Amino acid sequence: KFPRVKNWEVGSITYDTLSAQAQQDGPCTPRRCLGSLVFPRAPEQLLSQARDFINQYYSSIKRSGSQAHEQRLQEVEAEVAATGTYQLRESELVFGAKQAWRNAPRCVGRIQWGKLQVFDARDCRSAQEMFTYICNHIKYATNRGNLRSAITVFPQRCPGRGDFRIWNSQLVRYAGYRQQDGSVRGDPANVEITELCIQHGWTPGNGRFDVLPLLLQAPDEPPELFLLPPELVLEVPLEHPTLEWFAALGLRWYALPAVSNMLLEIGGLEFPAAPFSGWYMSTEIGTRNLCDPHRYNILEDVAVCMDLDTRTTSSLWKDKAAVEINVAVLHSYQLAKVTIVDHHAATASFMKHLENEQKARGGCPADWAWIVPPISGSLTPVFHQEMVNYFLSPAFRYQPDPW
Amino acid sequence: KFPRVKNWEVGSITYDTLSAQAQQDGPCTPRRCLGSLVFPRAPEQLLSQARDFINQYYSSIKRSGSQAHEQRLQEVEAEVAATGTYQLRESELVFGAKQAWRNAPRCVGRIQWGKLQVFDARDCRSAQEMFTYICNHIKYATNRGNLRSAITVFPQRCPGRGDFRIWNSQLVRYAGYRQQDGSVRGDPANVEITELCIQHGWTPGNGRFDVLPLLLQAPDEPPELFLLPPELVLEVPLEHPTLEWFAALGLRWYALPAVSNMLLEIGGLEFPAAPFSGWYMSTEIGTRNLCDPHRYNILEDVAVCMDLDTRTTSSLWKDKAAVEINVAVLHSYQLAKVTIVDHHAATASFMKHLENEQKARGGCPADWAWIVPPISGSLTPVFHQEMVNYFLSPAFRYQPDPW
Numbered sequence: 159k160f161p162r163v164k165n166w167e168v169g170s171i172t173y174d175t176l177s178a179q180a181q182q183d184g185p186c187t188p189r190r191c192l193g194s195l196v197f198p199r200a201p202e203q204l205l206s207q208a209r210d211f212i213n214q215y216y217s218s219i220k221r222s223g224s225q226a227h228e229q230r231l232q233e234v235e236a237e238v239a240a241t242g243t244y245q246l247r248e249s250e251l252v253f254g255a256k257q258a259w260r261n262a263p264r265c266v267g268r269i270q271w272g273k274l275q276v277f278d279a280r281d282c283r284s285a286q287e288m289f290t291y292i293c294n295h296i297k298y299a300t301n302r303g304n305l306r307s308a309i310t311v312f313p314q315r316c317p318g319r320g321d322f323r324i325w326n327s328q329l330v331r332y333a334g335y336r337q338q339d340g341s342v343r344g345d346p347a348n349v350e351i352t353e354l355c356i357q358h359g360w361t362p363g364n365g366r367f368d369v370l371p372l373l374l375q376a377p378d379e380p381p382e383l384f385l386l387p388p389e390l391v392l393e394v395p396l397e398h399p400t401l402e403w404f405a406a407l408g409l410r411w412y413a414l415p416a417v418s419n420m421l422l423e424i425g426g427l428e429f430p431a432a433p434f435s436g437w438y439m440s441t442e443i444g445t446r447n448l449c450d451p452h453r454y455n456i457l458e459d460v461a462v463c464m465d466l467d468t469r470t471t472s473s474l475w476k477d478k479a480a481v482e483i484n485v486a487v488l489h490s491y492q493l494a495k496v497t498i499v500d501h502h503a504a505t506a507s508f509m510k511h512l513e514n515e516q517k518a519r520g521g522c523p524a525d526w527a528w529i530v531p532p533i534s535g536s537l538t539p540v541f542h543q544e545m546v547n548y549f550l551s552p553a554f555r556y557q558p559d560p561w
Numbered sequence: 562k563f564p565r566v567k568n569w570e571v572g573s574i575t576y577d578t579l580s581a582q583a584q585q586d587g588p589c590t591p592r593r594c595l596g597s598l599v600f601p602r603a604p605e606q607l608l609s610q611a612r613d614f615i616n617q618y619y620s621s622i623k624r625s626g627s628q629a630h631e632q633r634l635q636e637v638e639a640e641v642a643a644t645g646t647y648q649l650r651e652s653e654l655v656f657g658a659k660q661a662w663r664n665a666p667r668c669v670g671r672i673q674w675g676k677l678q679v680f681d682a683r684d685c686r687s688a689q690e691m692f693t694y695i696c697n698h699i700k701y702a703t704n705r706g707n708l709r710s711a712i713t714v715f716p717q718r719c720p721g722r723g724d725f726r727i728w729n730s731q732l733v734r735y736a737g738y739r740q741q742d743g744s745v746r747g748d749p750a751n752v753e754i755t756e757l758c759i760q761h762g763w764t765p766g767n768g769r770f771d772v773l774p775l776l777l778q779a780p781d782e783p784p785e786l787f788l789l790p791p792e793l794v795l796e797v798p799l800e801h802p803t804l805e806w807f808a809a810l811g812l813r814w815y816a817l818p819a820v821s822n823m824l825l826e827i828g829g830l831e832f833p834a835a836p837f838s839g840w841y842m843s844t845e846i847g848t849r850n851l852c853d854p855h856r857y858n859i860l861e862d863v864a865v866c867m868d869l870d871t872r873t874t875s876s877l878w879k880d881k882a883a884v885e886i887n888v889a890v891l892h893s894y895q896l897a898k899v900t901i902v903d904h905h906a907a908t909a910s911f912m913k914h915l916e917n918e919q920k921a922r923g924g925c926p927a928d929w930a931w932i933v934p935p936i937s938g939s940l941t942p943v944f945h946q947e948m949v950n951y952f953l954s955p956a957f958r959y960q961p962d963p964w
């Protein structure tokens with residue numbers, strides 16, 4: 159029996175048959191669930207992964223068992239036998255990157271998974287060429303505020319050559335300066351890469367919203383520093399529709415969420431550098447980035463300014479300030495004409511995705527704790543949706559920092 | 562072997578050594594995590610559970626391997642040889658009820674686990690004595706609004722004999738009625754028990770907050786309809802400290818969360834009727850019971866009265882209206898001098914509970930999805946706390962309905 163999956167809002171019941179195809183194992187056992195953990199830490203093995211991926215490709219174009227399907231499998235087997243590896247066709251790379259997104263359990267934005275611009279950077283040969291690829295990516299995906307999902311796939315990992323790596327966790331990140339108190343000026347999430355940027359010659363600023371340079375690693379080559387063209391880096395000043403003092407906080411966020419530090423794995427091949435981007439869900443900026451105590455931690459300042467009773471928890475000042483901070487983010491992005499999605503629309507679109515995927519594949523790997531927004535969780539429909547978390551391939555994977 | 566567990570706000574690491582003692586098996590496997598699922602899924606068997614609970618108990622009182630330890634062991638052995646079951650000492654029962662609460666992974670109020678009033682009703686027979694026990698419980702636990710945690714333990718299941726069952730999921734429940742447009746007046750959660758109360762004699766009200774009668778069932782006998790004395794059921798009319806129209810909405814809730822459909826398991830013994838009660842966390846009332854789409858679903862009503870823009874999700878009218886409902890709840894319980902805890906205080910206390918349990922016994926089973934509040938998740942410290950979920954015994958367990 160496949161796991162019975164219930165929606166408690168409607169009473170509806172599904173069975174996730176797709177989970178039975180999970181390959182790489184997760185961290186849970188019958189003895190103890192570790193779903194809440196942030197991190198769950200060669201010829202023939204490659205071949206079965208490659209074979210399965212090719213089968214996935216030929217299923218997607220409704221040509222399984224075709225002459226071309228058989229021939230591509232034989233073709234991959236021949237290349238793996240001669241070289242120990244193989245090369246994706248362009249069409250398989252596009253398909254692979256979209257499947258990797260489709261398969262990402264913590265992604266609430268996967269309604270969009272079939273609308274992904276795949277930039278093939280596989281013949282990239284230096285950190286300078288990398289930077290040019292990344293600028294094109296940023297330019298295409300920003301699209302002057304009309305954001306478009308993109309992924310740029312740099313060359314796959316191969317024996318006898320180091321990896322392309324982007325040291326930054328996102329293409330656009332604000333600096334975080336370890337101030338000499340032990341405190342931090344800027345984004346505390348980014349003190350480490352801030353430290354490494356300076357160490358590599360970057361003259362640091364002193365604001366709370368200093369865009370970091372990129373540290374780009376070509377294979378067998380220490381990382382190289384590149385400054386983004388400031389006009390490629392679209393940013394949103396934060397104002398509140400009704401709280402006019404909010405603008406005086408001087409809050410900014412950037413338009414493009416572009417994760418650059420995960421590994422893309424497709425049919426056994428690994429792409430350590432394959433930055434990908436979409437558009438923000440506003441709770442990422444409003445609640446996590448600006449209200450996490452270990453981030454910009456502005457919750458109390460806004461609340462004091464709102465004249466809330468911060469002396470007692472029971473006034474719900476924290477919830478009140480946080481809601482208004484999320485309102486400001488959405489208002490400010492809509493005002494700047496920068497794509498943004500609120501957690502209500504995002505989670506409703508995800509409910510549509512689950513329904514599509516149940517039809518399409520008989521299931522959908524989903525990490526409930528990450529799909530539920532960080533505010534107002536049970537006000538969104540995904541709260542009441544039981545979800546099955548499992549690992550499919552192609553996949554985006556966390557990988558160690560390259561230092 | 563021992564899961565590493567990290568707090569991401571603080572950066573503190575602990576290891577959960579207690580999860581190694583996981584008596585039973587949960588639903589997760591290496592292939593797939595089912596953490597988000599609400600329902601995961603004699604004679605010598607009795608002995609080994611009974612033996613190990615006795616061992617537990619005598620370990621906890623620092624009388625390990627001692628004199629009364631051996632005597633107790635041979636007592637249960639002989640008891641089960643004689644009868645097929647055995648009897649708990651009244652202190653073992655108290656210890657087993659407290660441990661079962663302490664072990665309940667989804668309970669955020671466990672900082673209180675050592676302060677529980679245990680009412681031994683193991684000498685009960687007929688539903689009329691059940692009703693008196695229950696009413697004493699309600700009366701003792703309400704305590705005119707200064708709520709005190711308590712459990713009443715009715716006779717254990719035994720071979721040959723039926724069971725004591727409280728058909729109601731809770732001692733205090735508002736009716737739910739259907740009409741010729743399919744909707745529900747009152748609490749949609751209780752449409753089933755409302756039909757049963759109606760069928761088994763109860764003449765129904767027609768209000769949104771009609772307190773249901775108690776369907777109490779004696780062994781083998783049908784269940785008898787009992788009405789709770791109105792003066793026993795302390796209710797809180799809901800009003801808002803600054804929104805004067807909120808009171809006119811007619812919202813109310815009851816003081817005593819008293820769950821009456823779970824099965825208490827102690828040392829191989831099973832108590833299919835053992836109602837327990839604490840006090841409410843305000844989000845259980847304001848967010849889940851009043852705002853769930855399948856409960857009272859009042860969010861849009863409140864938002865309309867707050868003159869919010871309800872035709873776009875991005876104004877966050879759901880979030881603003883949810884918070885004010887929770888404020889109303891907190892204000893109304895405080896003003897009425899009824900024990901209530903807000904999700905900030907409650908989650909701050911569970912953090913303390915995690916820290917005490919780390920030192921008391923190596924860990925603490927916790928179900929992140931249920932510990933994290935349904936509003937303002939990441940504003941609470943439990944959000945950033947990794948957790949391990951496993952089943953210890955003694956335990957509270959769900960059980961099939963008596964029908």
Ligand code: HEM
Pocket residue numbers: 255259261262263264265266267268270274307308309420434435436437438439442499504528554
């Ligand atoms: C199009 C708009 C998108 C939205 C609104 C969105 C939203 C999100 C959110 C809210 C998270 C959780 C992050 C956190 O809470 O810190 C996430 C995770 C993630 N997203 Fe998306 N995303 C989008 C596009 C994409 C794209 C284009 C890709 C890749 C092609 C992607 C892949 C991922 C991955 C790999 C993760 C985390 C790892 C995992 O899923 O287990 N997302 N996304």
Ligand code: HEM
Pocket residue numbers: 658662665666667668669670671673677710711712837838839840841842845902907931957
């Ligand atoms: C004293 C104040 C208490 C508070 C504030 C509290 C809070 C909560 C909350 C918020 C839940 C989650 C249920 C939901 O949100 O739907 C829960 C579940 C639960 N509570 Fe507590 N509770 C308290 C007392 C108690 C007591 C006295 C007992 C038993 C002696 C208990 C045992 C349980 C159990 C068994 C569950 C379900 C856990 C599971 O299914 O694994 N709690 N509690």
Ligand SMILES: Cc1cc(N)nc2cc(-c3ccc(OCC4CC4)c(CN)c3)c(F)cc12
Pocket residue numbers: 196197267415416417434435436437438439442556
């Ligand atoms: C394309 C995209 C769009 C968006 N709107 N959002 C996104 C968020 C993440 C993301 C994934 C994991 C994360 O956390 C890493 C945990 C430590 C392992 C975070 C930061 N919380 C963000 C991501 F990859 C991609 C995103």
Ligand SMILES: Cc1cc(N)nc2cc(-c3ccc(OCC4CC4)c(CN)c3)c(F)cc12
Pocket residue numbers: 599670818819820837838839840841842845
């Ligand atoms: C003593 C106590 C206090 C409190 N303050 N709260 C409590 C909540 C529950 C509880 C357990 C499981 C639940 O789940 C029901 C599944 C659908 C059948 C729910 C409702 N969500 C509540 C409970 F037992 C006891 C509680």
Ligand SMILES: C[C@H](O)[C@H](O)[C@H]1CNc2nc(N)[nH]c(=O)c2N1
Pocket residue numbers: 194195196527528529530569944945946947948
């Ligand atoms: C400890 C906990 O797992 C951790 O803070 C997670 C929980 N759920 C999350 N969910 C999302 N979407 N994003 C996050 O960063 C987190 N953080």
Ligand SMILES: C[C@H](O)[C@H](O)[C@H]1CNc2nc(N)[nH]c(=O)c2N1
Pocket residue numbers: 166541542543544545596597598599930931932933
């Ligand atoms: C699907 C999911 O498991 C379900 O909605 C859970 C999630 N977390 C919860 N958390 C609490 N405290 N109470 C609940 O009823 C639930 N419901």
Ligand SMILES: [Ca+2]
Pocket residue numbers: 245
């Ligand atoms: Ca070739």
Ligand SMILES: [Ca+2]
Pocket residue numbers: 741742
């Ligand atoms: Ca009709």
Ligand SMILES: [Cl-]
Pocket residue numbers: 415442447
């Ligand atoms: Cl971000």
Ligand SMILES: [Cl-]
Pocket residue numbers: 818845850
């Ligand atoms: Cl309740």
Ligand SMILES: [Gd]
Pocket residue numbers: 400401402
């Ligand atoms: Gd104003």
Ligand SMILES: [Gd]
Pocket residue numbers: none
């Ligand atoms: Gd009005």
Ligand SMILES: [Zn+2]
Pocket residue numbers: 186190191192193589593594595596
């Ligand atoms: Zn799990």
